[PDB]
Specification:
This is part of a larger assembly, with two copies of chain A (about 325 residues). Chain A is mainly α and about 325 residues long. Chain A is built from 13 helices and two strands; from the N terminus they run H-H-H-H-H-H-H-H-H-H-H-H-E-E-H. The first copy, chain A, is about 45% helix and about 0% strand. The longest helix of chain A is centred in the middle third of the chain and has 23 residues. Chains A, B: Scorpion hemocyanin is a 24-chain polymer with 8 different chains identified, assembled in hexameric substructures.
């Protein structure tokens, strides 16, 4: 039944961190699996980076490809052993969302699956400590609120920024509209995904601005210049997988090139986009021009800007 | 014979400087050079600069144009007296290489023609000094190796960088494939010169990198950012022809516009080139687009990048 199906899915989601240790004599048998497994388990998975996204896409496809739900569970069970866990959650969630066979099925809570992302280093540590401190069946309760000196006014916004629901939503939205989404492979297409990308993010900003004003703060200003130094932020999140945590960002240094990408790469792309707007057309790979139609324009721009697989160039 | 022809060309080039003193009472006399007559003798000749290259090209053409070898010697003889010497060596070498009257005419070895470029000033003026110090037929021998505190690890690479053979090769290669080369005028074309330009330089870098690693040094990093200050280098080379020497450069100052060109323009040219590579086509003067074909692409790029006369734009 559906209920049974739900039960099977929940365990795909359990003890992801632990699920590592491949226990696989050979991947060769898993021909389907050959494509994935580049990213190491412990490593952090990036939703944004292209290479990471590529692996993720490869994983989803296998899941989509799965002939039946049972087959789906099997490959998933096996894949989860090798692949980086973050990528795994990402690929599986996408599969659950789209794949018909999964006409059954919620995904386990993101907050619940990775509590460490939702709550601070202290209350993670506390609940772990209490667990060890006195063994007992008894329940442990920890109040995350803390006691601290409130130095930055940005702190006021924390109710909005830190909110569990907001973070969860953002995770889910990207799952429904993956950047990697290839309509040919799935066959189905996500209507107006580029435009939606634009709208959803715009709303988040708009909503954010309302908070600042409620706060008595001015509206947020854009990252209009790349040269400017960034404000620092320390998340105080320790990623349970690892002993490592998300690195905090101290105050103020201009932007640094990464091996993967340059800054004048970045800037150039921005001018291209802003130019093509002005010209009212964008150039496809074919070197044909497509007009930024009133109907189509936002969608086309969304794909290019994000950018999705859908980007015309 | 051809070897007797050698014996004349070599003393044509022998001691360039003192064969100047134009010694033709009226400037108009050489209408043959009324188009040029811009860069004086003593001045340093730039292989890279466009204006210098233009003069050089003009010279070669005259040499190519020479009806016969005897005519070739004549114009060369007389032209050498008036033109800058560096340009002269450049133009003549190109002529010798291509012009059918010249097979089996090697050029005077570059190192031998301009010993000052190959060896340090100290062994130039020591040797000159010994010549004056005691007049005697006896031979003079000077060991260039020196003795000095070797503060910079870059010094280790000197065996590679300073090598006489390497420098000579680089000189010769540019002669075989001149940037100025105009296929219409010569009639013949240099096959895949643009690609060769790319390959030869790439190899020099690759070979260089192997030296650094042999040294235990990391691979060289590209000068991507125009803003960054350069490392200094002092050549310790003198130009006997005059008092002058190649100016040394210390490190630590960002890049300066020249009257001839501004750095900003350089950046432009790069973004221009990158775009073309990206959209897979380049724009010709005609404003037609030529594709960066798999076969053709490197060659077309080479001409544009260097850039040669061949550049499409």
């Amino acid at each position: 039944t559906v209920a049974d199906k739900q039960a099977r899915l929940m365990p795909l989601f359990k003890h992801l961190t632990a699920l590592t240790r491949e226990k696989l004599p050979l991947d060769q048998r898993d021909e389907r699996l050959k494509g994935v497994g580049i990213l190491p388990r412990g490593t952090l998975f990036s939703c944004f980076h292209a290479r990471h996204l590529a692996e993720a896409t490869e994983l989803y496809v296998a899941l989509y490809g799965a002939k039946d739900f049972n087959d789906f569970i099997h490959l998933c069970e096996q894949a989860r052993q090798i692949v980086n866990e973050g990528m795994f959650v990402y690929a599986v969630s996408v599969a659950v969302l789209h794949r018909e066979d999964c006409k059954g099925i919620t995904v386990p809570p993101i907050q619940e699956v990775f509590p460490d992302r939702f709550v601070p280093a202290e209350t993670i540590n506390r609940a772990n400590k209490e667990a060890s401190n006195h063994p007992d069946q008894q329940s442990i309760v920890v109040e995350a609120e803390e006691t601290g000196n409130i130095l930055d006014p940005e702190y006021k916004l924390s109710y909005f920024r830190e909110d569990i629901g907001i973070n969860a939503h953002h995770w889910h939205w990207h799952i429904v509209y993956p950047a990697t989404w290839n309509p040919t492979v799935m066959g189905k297409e996500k209507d107006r995904k580029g435009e939606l990308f634009f709208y959803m993010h715009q709303q988040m900003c708009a909503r954010y601005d309302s908070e600042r004003l409620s706060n008595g703060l001015q509206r947020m200003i854009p990252f209009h210049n790349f040269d400017e130094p960034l404000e620092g932020y320390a998340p105080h999140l320790t990623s349970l997988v690892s002993g490592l945590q998300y690195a905090s960002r101290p105050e103020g240094y201009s932007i640094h090139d990464l091996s993967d990408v340059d800054v004048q790469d970045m800037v150039r792309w921005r001018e291209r986009i802003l130019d093509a707007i002005n010209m009212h057309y964008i150039v496809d790979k074919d070197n044909n021009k497509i007009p930024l139609d009133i109907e189509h324009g936002t969608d086309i721009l969304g794909d290019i800007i994000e950018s999705s697989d859908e980007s015309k160039n």
